[PDB]
Amino acid sequence: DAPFDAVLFDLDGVLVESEGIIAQVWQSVLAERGLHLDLTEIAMYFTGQRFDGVLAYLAQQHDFVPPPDFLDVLETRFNAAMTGVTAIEGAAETLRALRAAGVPFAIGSNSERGRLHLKLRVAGLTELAGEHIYDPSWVGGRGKPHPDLYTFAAQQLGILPERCVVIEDSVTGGAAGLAAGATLWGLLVPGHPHPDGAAALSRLGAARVLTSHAELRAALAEAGLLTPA
Numbered sequence: 001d002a003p004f005d006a007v008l009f010d011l012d013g014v015l016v017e018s019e020g021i022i023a024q025v026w027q028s029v030l031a032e033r034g035l036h037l038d039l040t041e042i043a044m045y046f047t048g049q050r051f052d053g054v055l056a057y058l059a060q061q062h063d064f065v066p067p068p069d070f071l072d073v074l075e076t077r078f079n080a081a082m083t084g085v086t087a088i089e090g091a092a093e094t095l096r097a098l099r100a101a102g103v104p105f106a107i108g109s110n111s112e113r114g115r116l117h118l119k120l121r122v123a124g125l126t127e128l129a130g131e132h133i134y135d136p137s138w139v140g141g142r143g144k145p146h147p148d149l150y151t152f153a154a155q156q157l158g159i160l161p162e163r164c165v166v167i168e169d170s171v172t173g174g175a176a177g178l179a180a181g182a183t184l185w186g187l188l189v190p191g192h193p194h195p196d197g198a199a200a201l202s203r204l205g206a207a208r209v210l211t212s213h214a215e216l217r218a219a220l221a222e223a224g225l226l227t228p229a
């Protein structure tokens with residue numbers, strides 16, 4: 001019983017860490033302007049939120065209206081900050097193991113293409129990540145949670161989607177994997193913010209929810225793709 005031929009990875013939260021860095025920028029920019037919020041609140045409600053929606057949130061939940069220089073200073077600091085993106089603990093090891101085993105894999109991300117490659121570069125994963133790296137410009141803009149990106153990724157590997165496992169840390173990305181016909185394994189490495197929690201991924205339909213790259217490799221070995229410890 002070999003369930004899988006190939007692995008499809010999300011980027012943010014699974015291979016690289018960036019949500020944490022961006023939350024820290026929101027926190028310091030607001031703090032300097034009077035408002036002190038917890039990183040968990042910032043990650044939960046500001047992430048993937050549009051700027052006017054953040055403004056609405058701040059007014060509604062915190063009676064707060066940032067001063068005029070808010071937009072200008074945030075974009076400055078968000079830019080200086082992309083620099084500090086790091087690899088997720090054990091991600092390089094998982095990519096190295098799949099490569100040594102000859103297991104096909106691809107990366108699918110909603111990031112704009114330049115940003116996608118920038119993050120892999122600064123995290124030191126460019127060489128390990130390989131050549132199958134897809135952002136929504138490859139599928140006409142129809143990014144996650146549409147299945148298109150993962151359908152396309154599987155096609156490029158020459159593998160049926162139903163024979164892929166998708167490694168995701170959000171309902172947005174996990175739904176794209178499931179809608180493509182793949183199996184979903186959630187991966188929620190602790191100490192890093194993720195858009196959704198384990199219960200939400202399980203309810204969505206994740207076959208399992210893993211908590212470390214070491215756990216991921218062990219599961220992959222159980223599935224016949226890697227060699228067990």
Ligand code: NA
Pocket residue numbers: 010011012013014168169170173
């Ligand atoms: Na993600």
